[PDB]
Amino acid sequence: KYRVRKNVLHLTDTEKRDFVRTVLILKEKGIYDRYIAWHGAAGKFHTPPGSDRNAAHMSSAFLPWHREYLLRFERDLQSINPEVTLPYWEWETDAQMQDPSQSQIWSADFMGGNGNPIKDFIVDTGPFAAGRWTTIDEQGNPSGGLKRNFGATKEAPTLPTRDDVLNALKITQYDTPPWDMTSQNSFRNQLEGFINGPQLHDRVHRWVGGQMGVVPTAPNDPVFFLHHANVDRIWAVWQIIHRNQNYQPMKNGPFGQNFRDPMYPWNTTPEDVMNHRKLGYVYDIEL
């Protein structure tokens, strides 16, 4: 419990110019791509083969898989600049605005704005605008520039609300059988957004649109990591208030989903990442 992680809205200007600069360095060095690829790779590892569950989504491991992913990413940030931690995008509060698109998390000094509808929704403002930031597709080849299209779908016109988050936090069980999108009374499935969906996580992806709207390719947008830090924060909060609850399934879920199974593409297990402060970080709202 040392490295913090702060609300994007509470970050000094200097902190943002430094976060963005560090992300650009990781991209230049070839490291950022590894994260895009890892995510896509996990999506093709079905547990078991033929199931809709995969190593990183639509099943128990969703939360610890992303925790590990962010942890590795934050370590790579810190190897460049030890003062840089991963911030979180508190979307539930942005949802309160008339036009969430006006949030400072899209400012030209940070993540840049919505896509330009005249350009096939290509982001042309901010540090990740086309020409300054190249994306890759699922073959692993350059794919022409970041796209975003806020709230453009009928299923996800708006971001999740504070009440949506509070309601998820009331759920007592981490997950329930059959450990997939049909799980009910499950914190995991609720937060992932498949109970009467899309809700929460799944809704944020859909709301942002562009690369974020396609799960495999989503990490092409740096906001992906901000989004997931918020998901991780919500989980950490759930763990704090439900101290006697533990990860499920403990055993006899599909291989890759159990407490002590390795999470492809790594050897890391859910047990390894259950306690976030032991990992070396904390969320501001804890302090």
Q: Binding residues for a copy of itself, per CB under 8 A?
A: 29-31, 33-34, 37-38, 40-41, 44-50, 54, 134, 136, 138-142, 254-256, 262, 264-265
Distance CA 64, CA 62 (A): 6
For residue 94, say whether it is annotated as part of any ligand binding site. no
Give residues with Cβ within 8 angstroms of 46, minimum separation 6: 52, 53, 54
Beta carbon nearer to a copy of itself, 26 or 111: 26
Closest distance to a copy of itself from the beta carbon of 117 (Å): 27
With contact defined as beta carbons under 8 Å apart, do 187 and 171 qualify? Answer: yes
For residue 284, say whether it is annotated as part of any ligand binding site. yes
Tokens of 264: 């492809």
Beta carbon nearer to a copy of itself, 54 or 190: 54
Distance CA 208, CA 220 (A): 13
DSSP 69-122: HHHHHHHHHHHH-TT----B--HHHHTTSSSGGGSGGGSTTTT----BGGGTTB
Cα–Cα distance list, 162 to 85, 90, 93 (Å): 25, 10, 7
Task: Dihedral sign for Cα 236, 238, 244, 250, please.
Answer: negative
For residue 175, say whether it is annotated as part of any ligand binding site. no
For residue 46, say whether it is annotated as part of any ligand binding site. yes
For residue 202, say whether it is annotated as part of any ligand binding site. no
Closest distance to a copy of itself from the beta carbon of 244 (Å): 30
For residue 15, say whether it is annotated as part of any ligand binding site. no
Beta carbon nearer to a copy of itself, 189 or 257: 257
Beta carbon nearer to a copy of itself, 53 or 276: 53
**Unique residue bearing structure tokens 């569950």:** 53
For residue 109, say whether it is annotated as part of any ligand binding site. yes
Nearest to 179 by CA among 40, 49, 62, 45: 62
Beta carbon nearer to a copy of itself, 31 or 129: 31
Beta carbon nearer to a copy of itself, 34 or 132: 34
Would you list which residues are annotated within the binding site for Cu(2+)? 39, 57, 66, 201, 205, 228
Would you list which residues are annotated within the binding site? 10, 13, 39, 46, 52, 57, 66, 68, 92, 109, 120, 163, 201, 205, 228, 242, 276-277, 284
Would you list which residues are annotated within the binding site for Zn(2+)? 10, 13, 39, 46, 52, 57, 66, 68, 92, 109, 120, 163, 201, 205, 228, 242, 276-277, 284
